[PDB]
Design an enzyme around this catalytic site. Structure first.
Site, mmCIF file in Angstrom:
data_model
loop_
_atom_site.group_PDB
_atom_site.id
_atom_site.type_symbol
_atom_site.label_atom_id
_atom_site.label_comp_id
_atom_site.label_asym_id
_atom_site.label_seq_id
_atom_site.Cartn_x
_atom_site.Cartn_y
_atom_site.Cartn_z
ATOM 1 N N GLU A 116 0.782 -1.262 0.000
ATOM 2 C CA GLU A 116 0.000 0.000 0.000
ATOM 3 C C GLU A 116 0.788 1.271 0.000
ATOM 4 O O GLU A 116 0.246 2.297 -0.378
ATOM 5 C CB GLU A 116 -0.954 0.008 1.217
ATOM 6 C CG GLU A 116 -1.808 -1.267 1.171
ATOM 7 C CD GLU A 116 -3.010 -1.140 0.269
ATOM 8 O OE1 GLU A 116 -3.017 0.004 -0.363
ATOM 9 O OE2 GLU A 116 -3.922 -1.949 0.191
ATOM 10 N N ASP B 215 -6.707 6.388 -4.856
ATOM 11 C CA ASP B 215 -6.173 5.066 -4.977
ATOM 12 C C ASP B 215 -6.228 4.547 -6.428
ATOM 13 O O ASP B 215 -6.510 5.285 -7.368
ATOM 14 C CB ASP B 215 -6.850 4.129 -3.970
ATOM 15 C CG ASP B 215 -8.236 3.657 -4.244
ATOM 16 O OD1 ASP B 215 -8.787 4.102 -5.310
ATOM 17 O OD2 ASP B 215 -8.806 2.911 -3.484
ATOM 18 N N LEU C 233 -9.000 3.830 2.976
ATOM 19 C CA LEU C 233 -9.966 4.449 2.113
ATOM 20 C C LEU C 233 -10.822 5.388 2.870
ATOM 21 O O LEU C 233 -11.356 4.997 3.899
ATOM 22 C CB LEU C 233 -10.852 3.360 1.500
ATOM 23 C CG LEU C 233 -12.088 3.902 0.775
ATOM 24 C CD1 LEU C 233 -11.702 4.394 -0.600
ATOM 25 C CD2 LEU C 233 -13.075 2.784 0.566
ATOM 26 N N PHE D 211 -8.281 -6.681 3.364
ATOM 27 C CA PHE D 211 -7.880 -5.283 3.585
ATOM 28 C C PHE D 211 -8.015 -4.475 2.328
ATOM 29 O O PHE D 211 -8.510 -3.387 2.301
ATOM 30 C CB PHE D 211 -6.399 -5.265 3.957
ATOM 31 C CG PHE D 211 -5.862 -3.909 4.293
ATOM 32 C CD1 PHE D 211 -5.446 -3.032 3.290
ATOM 33 C CD2 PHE D 211 -5.768 -3.517 5.628
ATOM 34 C CE1 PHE D 211 -4.971 -1.767 3.630
ATOM 35 C CE2 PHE D 211 -5.200 -2.299 5.990
ATOM 36 C CZ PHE D 211 -4.855 -1.409 4.976
ATOM 37 N N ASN E 89 -7.076 -20.316 -10.088
ATOM 38 C CA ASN E 89 -8.426 -19.743 -10.028
ATOM 39 C C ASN E 89 -8.394 -18.280 -9.528
ATOM 40 O O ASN E 89 -9.125 -17.396 -9.951
ATOM 41 C CB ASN E 89 -9.280 -20.634 -9.096
ATOM 42 C CG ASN E 89 -10.725 -20.188 -9.060
ATOM 43 O OD1 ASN E 89 -11.189 -19.354 -8.231
ATOM 44 N ND2 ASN E 89 -11.453 -20.670 -10.050
#
Ligand SMILES: Cc1ccccc1C
Ligand SMILES: [Cl-]
Ligand SMILES: [Cl-]
EC number: 3.2.1.17
Length: 162
Positions: free
Chosen positions: A11, A20, A32, A104, A132
């Site tokens: 981050e 972002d 956020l 997160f 996957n």
């Protein structure tokens, strides 16, 4: 290596409101603020979060404080989720960190569409789950981060982070 260092790498750290990857107002270490397109709305959420008139700017300490609450809240969200908990409980410590990173980043809700991956993880079919997980918008939008998290689930090691 640990969850905190891991997310700090994924981050970054910014002390002033920024947008972002999705264009949403964020600050600190991936915190956020709001999905609304209003900077003002963002600054209001910021002041409410910090408990002071920030003017869109926070200190490293305050950033770290948000981060600690966010990690904790993430874990707790997983533990309170009936779809999640049982998978999470099945994992080793390193892979749990990978689970936390995803929640997160995308919320409990973003991880809702990963049913089939979840089931693979629970059965410990690593290479399969890794393939996957890659079939996702997540992987296509944030490919470098996605690969690090995927490698982590695949290997049960922190190699992607060294
Ligand atoms: C998001 C999540 C939560 C618990 C286990 C695995 C995963 C990917
Ligand atoms: Cl908050
Ligand atoms: Cl990325």
């Amino acid at each position: 290596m640990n969850i905190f260092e891991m997310l700090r790498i994924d981050e970054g750290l910014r002390l002033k409101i920024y947008k972002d990857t999705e264009g949403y107002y964020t600050i600190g270490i991936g915190h956020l603020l709001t999905k609304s397109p209003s900077l003002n709305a963002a600054k209001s959420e910021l002041d409410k979060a910090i408990g002071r008139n920030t003017n869109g700017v926070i200190t490293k300490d305050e950033a770290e404080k948000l981060f600690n609450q966010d990690v904790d809240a993430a874990v707790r969200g997983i533990l309170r989720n009936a779809k999640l908990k049982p998978v999470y409980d099945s994992l080793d410590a390193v892979r749990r960190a990978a689970a936390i990173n995803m929640v997160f980043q995308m919320g409990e809700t973003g991880v809702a569409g990963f049913t089939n991956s979840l089931r693979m993880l629970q059965q410990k079919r690593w290479d399969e789950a890794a393939v996957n997980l890659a079939k996702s918008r997540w992987y296509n939008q944030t490919p470098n981060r996605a690969k690090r998290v995927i490698t982590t689930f695949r290997t049960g090691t922190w190699d992607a982070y060294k």
